[PDB]
Structure formats: structure tokens, C-alpha cells
């Protein structure tokens, strides 16, 4: 069974991509270093060569040293350890790694190329390294020591230091200062009167340096002589200042500690290594019992607590990307899950430790996906029965009579949350006969909380028998004099004549009484209305203005609300596979008027504001809304005017299954036709590179193909470095699609400027390589006429350019009846560009040699006589 999977890795390296191949060997190591001592080391050589193929040098070095461990006969292990130590920055070990491999096999040019680059590398490396130490020391003296100009010189000095670590791994080694950046950084966050931009840039340098492994792991060890106290401080670093963005960026230093102890995706799709996890399990129990223990700590703050909850969903779901199985269940088997339930009960009114209203999202989702990482067999049941025994622990203890009302609101708020996350167990609990009467008992009490949450409970239940109970109580509670209960109940009318909307308009149009959660439910109800309400909303201006202002005004829970607000009015979501035709609200020009007013009222800043949630399906909805804003007369300027694309690519990195593709086609429709230094200026042009890739991954059949071509048509019009960035992702399979299937497409004129310009090393090796004969032939056949003005010119320009090559002029003598049709369709045809485009193409064809100069004779003369007049 060992060999039967060992073959599949190397086959997977060459079948399509190595991105899938690297994990195959990683699965194949499960019986290694036990059942056999022959297969395990060589599979370690192949796996380390596999991650070396990607961009992971740390694991490749620590597996190449694992396979050298048996005898050191592996030569590819030495070439790989030296290739890793080359990019590692420490080229000294790479050189002695490579001299001991080239001495074993004197042949093979690559072993020589490594030593060739290493000679100059070690040669200059001491000079550049002492210059890097004077730059590191001059930088530390400026940003954090006695320096002038107050904020201005410091906030810039570190700003150069972050790039001194960020774009150079060798400079990343020198900014960390062998283990000295940390005390300076944490000494900065300790200043209560420090500008927070300085604090966030400092930590940003901090996580950058520890991105690797040991530099991060020493960041745990250095703080206390004994380990558990030393991981506490790293965890408890968010409990230092907590300004606004300080907590989000002090969170990633803790996130980075997960990436070290088990090696993880960081962003791009890479699986953790069990081999490191089992070694570092001691660290992971220590940090996760520390995050669990600080999850209920009263001293722990509001937002830093829910960022502490973000770390769990992002790390312990082994069916997504995190600690492997057996640790996902170590969390449920003890207090880790029972205590995890408790925080979902607490609400901004009843808590005991600070809790935010936003907590909702962060507490729903990590339970829901905990149902996704419990997709074993005894997992489903141990999870459910832990929740059922907690629910039984709460009903028997609530005694909603003698000041036990707090227990009844606690169980109610615990149940309202799980209808937002794990519905499979949440409806499983509202089966109980004790539930409905207690719900009713809160419904009529003078305790204003119990009634509000009461209407919130059944509006959460909106997807069987308890459902018919709660609706009548909802409408009888709608009349309530208090806004919290009327606004909390109006959602449930929409959740089942548009009479309610005339009150929904005044609910948010008057920004006086309603502010915090009051406006929030006022929008949530608005989201549940659809069908023809669209135009009735569009013909009011204060509706869009007040919805945008409400989303700008702390729209943290305004997520799915706005995302379904602008999506349903115009946008359409595709689904797997009479009434609409008569609709004058979402079908014809009214769909254009809806986005036309929606954008000019200012929906974009509300979108970038409410996108900060990790809600995958709300990410898909905001992506669909964003592409729906695009493809209109002046909308192309409107997207960039606030930053639609800049967060569109931000949502491409993490979205739902179709959310990445909706984001990708969204960026394509958004730009393209604007300008090359507008659709991705400066440092952002490279970020737009990746989304264009995997946009040809499916098939060239729908409207998603033509946009994917048209945006790349302008992606390479400026600067060569971008054209060389495109080559490293290999666009060849993509162009192969429209080479032999698309009929009505301008993509040929883009492929011309692609193959012609680009990097010299690539495009010279691409215009020539592979059977290009039919490519040259279609370069001539379509340049004749073909009822198109541009095809005849852009097709001809590559004829005039390629004619200049020496190897290329032998192959032109394969087709001769193609030249009468292009030489005639230049003087006789009515087009203007094709005449100058064709005459210059003919002259270079008659200037290469005399063998073809007589084969045409008259086809050229028909143009030469026409030119003189």
C-alpha cells in the first residue's frame, strides 16, 4: 500500500499541477519511519522536492535534512537543501550544501548553476549584510529611540523598516536582528499616548519577521523561562491597548503562532503537516487552553474577545484548514466545548464579561463550521449530546420566576444564536415541550428585554409546530409602544401587501431615536422583502441615503442585510442545473435605473465597510452586487472613485464557493475599458495578476470568457515587468481555449499584443515553440478581410514583425494562395487601416529572399500601382 500511493505523487506532479502533488506524499508518510526504512527517506526526498517546487523552503529544508538523516546518499536532497538555503538568505550553508553534491556527481548543469550564483552571492553577501546591519541599526535609532520631528520621522522610519523586512527574506533576517525586534516592538505598544498607526506598523513588521518558523517560535519562548506563562503573554497581547485596527493586527501575531506549530495555509491553499503538529502539540494545547481560558475572562475586552473567537474557526476545523483530527475532538471532550457554548448565551445586556453586539457573527460561524469539522460518525452525536446536556443544564436551572429570569434570557439568546449557525441542532432543541410555554411566558411580561428577544427568537426561527405558535404572538407584540419591540417585530412580517414597508421607510429615514441595534433590525427586516418592492425603493432617495449612512455608522451586523439589499433589487445569482416577463421592476430598463441611482447615492463605502465580516455567503452577495454595479456608462470611474476593485480583489482571496468567481468576473467587468494605470495603479497591478488566472479554469462557453479575455487585453499594454509576472503563472492552457473554439471574439487582437511584446526571454520562446504553423496561417487568413476592421490590421502587424526573423522565413513558403487574398483586400477593400497594414506586411515578405519574390509578382504590383495614386 506504500508504493501504491508513492507512485501517485510523482504522477500528480506532471498530470496537471504540483499544488495537489505536495500533499500526496504528505499523506503517504503516515506509515513512514516504522514499517520500512527504505521507502520513507526517498519519499521524504520527493516530498521536499515537491514543496521546493512551490515556494516553501523551510519545510523543504527540514525534510531534506530528514532524508539525509539515514546515510546522506541522497544527492537530490543536497541540491534541494542548497536551493532552499539559497532563497533562505543564509547562503553560507547553501554553498557547502552544494559543493558536497557537485563533488558527488560532477555532471548536470543545474548543480553548477547553483554554485555559479552562489559565488557572487557569498562574494557580495558580507558587504550587503554589513550594509544591512548599518541600515537596521540606523532604522532602529530613528523609529524607536531619541529622534526628532515627533510623528513625522518615526512613522516614516519604521515604514521603511517594514519594507526592509518585507520584500527581501535576507532583509527579513536582518530586521529581526537575530532576536531583538520584539522588545522594541512591545515596548512601543506600552505607550498609552502613541499614535495607533505607528503601533500597527510596528506589529506589522513583527508578524512579517516571524512569518517563517523558528523566528516565530522564539517569539513564544523568549518571554518567560517556563513555557505556559510565555504563551499567555503572546495570547494576552491584544489586552494591551485595543484602539480600533490595533486589535485586528495584534490578532495576526497569535494567528501566526498557529501557522508555526502546525505549518498552515496563511492565505494560499496549503495543508498543515502532521509531522510538525505532533511535535508541537505541547505548544498547541498550551495556546488553545489559553485562548479557551481567556475566552470567558472578565478582564478580556469586547472586540478583542471576538477576535479571540475568530482564531478558533480559522484553526481547529480540520475539515477546512487547521489542526488535524483528534485535536478537533480534544476541544469537545473537556471544558473546551461546554464553555464555548456559554459565550453565545451572553448579550450586551446580560453577560458578566464585556460582549459586543457584533459578537453574533463570530459566535454563530465557528459553531456552524464546528458542525462541519464534526462530519465523522461518533462526532455528530458527541457534539449534539454535549449541546443537549447543556440545554438540559439550563432549562432545569432557569426557574423563570424568582430572579431566574436572567437564566431564561440567557437560554433564549443561546438559542437565537444557533439558528444563525448550526441549524441542525438548533431546530433539534426547539422540539422540546418546555420551550414554547417559557417563550410565551416571556412574551407578555413587563420586562422589556424578554419581550424584545421573544420576537427576535421566532424571527430567528424563520426557515414546524412551534412556528405556528410564535407568529401570532409576534404580531400581537408588534403594536408595542417601545421601538425595540416594534422594530424587533417588523422583521417577522417581512420574514413571511407591502404595508410594512411604509413604516420601514420612516424607521430608518429618521436618524434620531433609533441608533445602535435599533437601526440594525430596521434594516434586517427591510432585507426580507423582495419581488416588485425594488422600484418602490429606488424612487425614494432618502432610503438609499439613510441605508448608506447606517452602513457607514458602525455597520458591523449590517452585513447580510445590505448584501441582500442591493443584490435582490438588480443582481441575479446563478443556480446549478411568464411572471418575470411582465415585471417592470427587475427585467429591462428598471434594472438599469436601480443600479444607476444606487451607485450615485453612494453604496460603495458602505460595501467596503460592511465587508469586514468573514461571512462567506455575504461575501458572495457583496461580490454579485459589485459586478452588478459595473458594466454601465460611467460606472467604470465610479468603482475606482471609492475603491470597489481594491476590496473586490480583497474579497477574492476568501469567499464562498462561487464567491471567488463572482469577485473575479466582477473585477473584470469593473475595469478593462478604463486605462492601464487606472485599473491597477502602482503596487496593486501585481495583485490583480492572480485573479485573471483561474478565470479560464472552467470552460470557454458563457459570458464569463469574453470578460476574462477583455481585461487581460489591457493588463499587458503597459510596462514589461507585468508581462513577465503573467508568464510565471503559465497562461498557455488558457489561450489554448480560445485558439480552437471561440468564434465571435476580439481576443485574437489581445493575443497579438501578448505574444509580440512581453518579456524577451518568454515571447521569443513562445512565438517559436510548439507547432506554430497554423498560428502563422491564421495570422494571414484573417488579415484579408473577414468583415472586421481590427482583425485585418492586428492580424497583419505580427506578419510584419515576424517576417524579420531568420528561422521564420523558411516556413512562409508553405501556403501561396493566402497572399492574393490579403494583397487584393488592401487596395480593393473599402477599409483604410488594412491598406497600410497590408502593404507594410507585403514589403517585409518580399525583402527576405528572392525565392518568393517572383511567386507573387502581380499581387504586389496591384498594391504598388494603387499606392502611387
Q: What are the residues whose beta carbons fall under 8 Å from the beta carbon of 566, sequence distance 6 or more? A: 598, 603, 607, 625, 628
CA-wise closest residue to 685 among 654, 705, 712: 712
Matching residue, cell 507585468: 722
User: If you write DSSP's letter for every residue of 417-437 in order, what string do you get?
Assistant: HHTTS-HHHHHHHTTSTTHHH
User: Which residue ranges does the chain devote to CATH 1.25.10.10?
Assistant: 129-509, 517-868
What is the C-alpha R_g of the chain? 32
Q: What are the residues whose beta carbons fall under 8 Å from the beta carbon of 764, sequence distance 6 or more? A: none
CA-wise closest residue to 439 among 402, 412, 459: 412
Specify the long-range contacts of residues 45-49, CB closer than 8 Å, at least 24 apart.
45/74, 45/76, 45/77, 45/80, 46/6, 46/9, 46/10, 47/9, 47/22, 48/77, 48/80, 49/76, 49/80
- CA–CA separation, 503 and 303 (whole Å): 33
Q: Which three cell numbers stand for residue 769?
A: 515553440
Matching residue, cell 527517506: 41
DSSP one-letter code for 850: S
Q: How many Cβ atoms sit within 10 Å of the Cβ of residue 8? A: 16
DSSP one-letter code for 272: P
CA-wise closest residue to 309 among 346, 349, 282: 346
User: Which residue ranges does the chain devote to CATH 1.25.40.10?
Assistant: 1-128
- CA–CA separation, 665 and 860 (whole Å): 46
Q: What are the residues whose beta carbons fall under 8 Å from the beta carbon of 297, sequence distance 6 or more? A: 353
- Strand positions, DSSP E, 397-532: none
Dihedral sign, CA of 591, 595, 598, 601? Answer: negative
- CA–CA separation, 623 and 668 (whole Å): 12
Burial (CB count <10 Å: 0-12, 13-18, 19+), residue 149: exposed
How many CA atoms within 13 Å lie on the side-chain side of 324? 17
- CA–CA separation, 44 and 28 (whole Å): 10
CB 252 within 8 A of CB 308: no
Q: Phi/psi class of residue 811: alpha, beta or left (left: φ > 0; alpha: ψ in -120 to 50)?
A: alpha
Matching residue, cell 492601464: 676
Which of 3.40.50.620, 1.10.10.10, 1.25.40.10, 3.40.50.300 would CATH assign to domain 1-128? 1.25.40.10
442-463 burial, b if ≥16 CB within 10 A, otherwise e? bbeeeeebbbbbbbbbbbbbee
Matching residue, cell 499587458: 716
H or E stretch at 219: helix 214-221
Burial (CB count <10 Å: 0-12, 13-18, 19+), residue 373: buried
- CA–CA separation, 823 and 840 (whole Å): 11
Matching residue, cell 424578554: 450
Q: What are the residues whose beta carbons fall under 8 Å from the beta carbon of 862, sequence distance 6 or more? A: 823, 824, 827
Please report, for residues 129, 164, 222, the alpha-carbon distance to residue 140 in angstroms, rounded to integers and kept in the order given.
16, 12, 20
Dihedral sign, CA of 567, 645, 242, 181? Answer: positive
CB 22 within 8 A of CB 51: yes
| Main-chain phi, psi angles of 74, to 5 degrees | -70, 115
Q: What are the residues whose beta carbons fall under 8 Å from the beta carbon of 728, sequence distance 6 or more? A: none
Burial (CB count <10 Å: 0-12, 13-18, 19+), residue 675: middle
CB 495 within 8 A of CB 528: yes
CA-wise closest residue to 862 among 809, 806, 824: 824
Q: How many Cβ atoms sit within 10 Å of the Cβ of residue 242? A: 15
Length of the chain: 869
CB 550 within 8 A of CB 558: yes
Which of 3.20.20.140, 1.10.420.10, 1.25.10.10, 1.10.1750.10 would CATH assign to domain 517-868? 1.25.10.10
CA-wise closest residue to 410 among 474, 352, 332, 471: 352
H or E stretch at 450: helix 448-461
Report the CATH number of the 129-509 domain: 1.25.10.10
Query: Which residues does a chain break follow in the chain (C to N more than 2.5 Å)?
Result: 463, 496, 577
CA-wise closest residue to 472 among 439, 430, 511, 521: 439
CA-wise closest residue to 780 among 735, 835, 841, 829: 841
Q: Which three cell numbers stand for residue 704?
A: 464569463
CA-wise closest residue to 332 among 365, 288, 301, 299: 288
- CA–CA separation, 514 and 775 (whole Å): 66
CA-wise closest residue to 269 among 82, 595, 22: 22
- CA–CA separation, 368 and 371 (whole Å): 5
- CA–CA separation, 850 and 831 (whole Å): 30
Q: Which three cell numbers stand for residue 269?
A: 491553499
Spell out the SS3 assignment of 277-333: HHHHHHHHHHHHHHHHHHHCCCCCCCHHHHHHHHHHHCCCCCCCCCCCCCCCCHHHH
Burial (CB count <10 Å: 0-12, 13-18, 19+), residue 760: exposed
Q: What are the residues whose beta carbons fall under 8 Å from the beta carbon of 769, sequence distance 6 or more? A: none
- CA 384-388-389 angle, 5° bins: 120
Q: Which three cell numbers stand for residue 107?
A: 555532471
Q: What are the residues whose beta carbons fall under 8 Å from the beta carbon of 364, sequence distance 6 or more? A: 344, 417, 418, 420, 421
Which structural technique was applied? Answer: X-ray
- CA–CA separation, 551 and 328 (whole Å): 36
Amino acid at each position: 500500500t506504500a508504493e501504491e500511493i508513492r507512485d501517485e505523487g510523482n504522477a500528480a506532479v506532471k498530470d496537471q499541477d504540483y499544488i495537489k502533488a505536495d500533499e500526496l506524499y504528505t499523506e503517504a508518510l503516515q506509515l513512514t519511519t516504522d514499517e520500512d526504512k527504505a521507502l520513507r527517506p526517498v519519499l521524504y526526498r520527493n516530498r521536499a522536492m515537491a514543496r521546493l517546487k512551490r515556494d516553501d523552503f523551510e519545510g523543504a529544508q527540514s525534510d531534506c535534512t530528514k532524508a539525509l538523516e539515514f546515510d546522506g546518499a541522497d544527492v537530490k536532497a543536497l541540491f534541494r537543501r542548497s536551493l532552499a538555503r539559497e532563497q533562505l538568505g543564509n547562503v553560507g550553508p547553501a554553498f557547502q550544501d552544494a559543493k558536497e553534491a557537485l563533488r558527488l556527481s560532477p555532471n548536470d548543469k543545474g548543480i553548477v548553476e547553483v554554485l555559479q550564483r552562489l559565488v557572487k552571492a557569498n562574494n557580495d553577501k558580507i558587504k550587503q549584510t554589513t550594509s544591512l546591519a548599518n541600515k537596521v541599526t540606523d532604522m532602529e535609532k530613528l523609529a524607536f529611540r531619541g529622534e526628532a520631528k515627533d510623528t513625522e520621522q518615526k512613522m516614516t522610519a519604521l515604514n521603511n523598516l517594514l519594507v526592509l523586512c518585507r520584500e527581501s527574506e535576507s532583509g527579513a533576517t536582518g530586521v529581526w536582528n537575530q532576536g531583538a525586534l520584539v522588545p522594541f516592538v512591545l515596548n512601543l505598544i506600552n505607550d498609552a499616548s502613541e499614535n495607533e498607526e505607528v503601533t500597527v506598523t510596528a506589529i506589522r513588521i513583527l508578524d512579517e519577521t516571524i512569518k517563517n518558523s523558528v523566528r516565530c517560535m522564539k517569539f513564544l519562548a523568549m518571554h518567560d523561562p517556563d513555557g505556559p506563562k510565555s504563551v499567555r503573554f503572546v495570547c494576552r497581547l491584544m489586552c494591551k491597548k485595543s484602539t480600533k485596527d490595533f486589535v485586528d493586527a495584534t490578532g495576526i501575531l497569535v494567528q501566526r503562532v498557529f501557522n508555526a506549530m502546525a505549518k498552515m495555509d496563511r492565505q494560499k491553499e496549503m495543508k498543515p503537516d502532521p509531522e510538525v503538529a505532533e511535535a508541537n502539540k505541547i505548544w498547541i494545547i498550551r495556546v488553545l487552553l489559553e485562548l479557551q481560558e481567556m475566552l470567558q475572562d472578565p478582564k478580556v475586552g469586547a472586540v478583542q474577545r471576538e477576535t479571540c473567537i475568530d482564531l478558533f474557526l480559522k484553526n481547529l476545523m480540520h475539515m477546512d484548514g487547521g489542526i488535524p483530527r483528534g485535536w478537533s475532538w480534544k476541544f469537545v471532550e473537556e471544558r473546551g466545548l461546554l464553555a464555548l457554548l456559554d459565550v453565545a448565551s451572553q448579550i450586551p445586556e446580560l453577560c458578566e464579561y464585556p460582549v459586543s453586539a457584533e459578537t453574533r457573527q463570530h459566535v454563530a460561524i465557528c459553531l456552524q463550521r464546528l458542525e462541519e469539522d464534526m462530519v465523522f460518525d461518533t462526532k455528530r452525536t458527541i457534539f449534539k449530546e454535549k449541546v443537549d446536556m447543556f440545554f438540559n443544564a439550563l432549562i432545569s436551572r432557569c426557574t423563570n420566576d424568582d430572579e431566574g429570569h436572567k437564566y431564561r434570557i440567557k437560554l433564549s439568546c443561546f438559542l437565537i444564536t444557533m439558528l444563525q449557525g448550526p441549524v441542525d441542532i438548533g431546530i433539534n432543541l426547539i422540539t422540546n415541550d418546555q420551550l414554547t410555554p417559557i417563550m410565551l411566558e416571556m412574551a407578555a411580561s413587563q420586562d422589556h428585554l424578554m419581550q424584545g428577544i421573544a420576537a427576535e427568537l421566532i424571527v430567528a426561527t424563520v426557515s414546524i409546530n412551534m412556528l405556528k405558535v410564535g407568529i401570532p404572538v409576534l404580531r400581537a407584540l408588534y403594536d408595542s409602544e417601545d421601538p425595540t419591540v416594534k422594530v424587533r417585530a417588523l422583521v417577522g412580517l417581512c420574514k413571511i401587501v407591502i404595508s410594512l414597508a411604509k413604516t420601514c421607510k420612516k424607521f430608518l429615514l429618521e436618524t434620531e431615536k433609533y441608533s445602535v441595534d435599533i437601526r440594525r433590525y430596521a434594516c434586517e427586516g427591510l432585507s426580507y422583502l423582495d419581488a416588485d418592492v425594488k422600484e418602490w425603493i429606488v424612487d425614494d432617495s432618502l432610503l438609499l441615503k439613510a441605508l448608506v449612512l447606517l452602513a457607514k455608522k458602525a455597520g458591523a451586523l449590517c452585513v447580510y442585510t445590505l448584501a441582500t439589499i442591493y443584490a435582490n433589487l438588480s443582481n441575479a445569482f446563478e443556480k446549478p442545473k411568464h411572471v418575470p416577463e411582465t415585471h417592470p421592476k427587475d427585467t429591462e430598463e428598471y434594472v438599469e435605473k436601480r443600479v444607476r441611482a444606487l451607485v450615485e447615492e453612494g453604496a460603495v463605502p458602505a460595501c467596503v465597510a460592511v465587508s469586514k465580516t468573514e461571512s462567506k455567503n455575504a461575501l458572495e452577495l457583496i461580490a454579485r452586487s459589485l459586478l452588478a454595479f459595473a458594466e454601465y456608462e460611467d460606472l467604470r470611474g465610479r468603482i475606482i472613485a471609492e475603491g470597489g476593485t481594491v476590496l473586490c480583489l480583497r474579497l477574492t482571496k476568501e469567499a464562498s464557493g462561487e464567491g471567488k468567481i463572482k469577485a473575479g468576473h466582477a473585477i473584470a467587468k469593473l475595469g478593462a475599458k478604463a486605462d492601464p494605470m487606472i485599473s491597477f495603479p502602482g503596487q496593486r497591478a501585481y495583485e490583480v495578476v492572480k485573479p485573471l488566472c483561474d478565470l479560464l479554469h472552467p470552460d470557454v462557453e458563457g459570458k464569463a470568457n469574453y470578460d476574462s479575455l477583455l481585461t487581460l487585453t489591457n493588463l499587458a499594454s503597459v510596462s514589461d515587468s507585468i508581462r513577465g509576472r503573467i508568464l510565471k503563472e503559465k497562461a498557455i492552457p488558457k489561450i489554448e481555449e480560445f485558439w480552437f473554439m471561440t468564434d465571435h471574439e476580439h481576443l485574437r487582437a489581445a493575443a497579438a499584443e501578448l505574444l509580440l511584446n512581453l518579456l524577451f526571454f518568454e515571447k521569443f520562446y513562445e512565438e517559436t515553440v510548439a507547432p506554430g504553423t497554423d498560428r502563422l496561417k491564421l495570422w494571414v487568413l484573417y488579415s484579408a478581410e473577414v468583415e472586421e476592421e481590427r482583425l485585418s490590421r492586428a492580424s497583419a502587424a505580427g506578419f510584419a514583425i515576424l517576417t524579420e526573423d531568420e528561422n521564420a522565413c523558411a516556413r512562409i513558403m508553405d501556403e501561396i494562395k493566402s497572399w492574393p487574398e490579403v494583397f487584393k483586400d488592401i487596395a480593393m477593400h473599402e477599409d483604410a487601416e488594412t491598406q497600410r497594414r497590408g502593404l507594410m506586411g507585403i514589403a517585409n515578405i518580399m525583402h527576405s529572399s528572392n525565392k518568393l519574390c517572383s511567386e507573387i509578382v502581380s499581387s504586389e504590383v496591384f498594391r504598388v500601382l494603387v499606392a502611387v495614386t
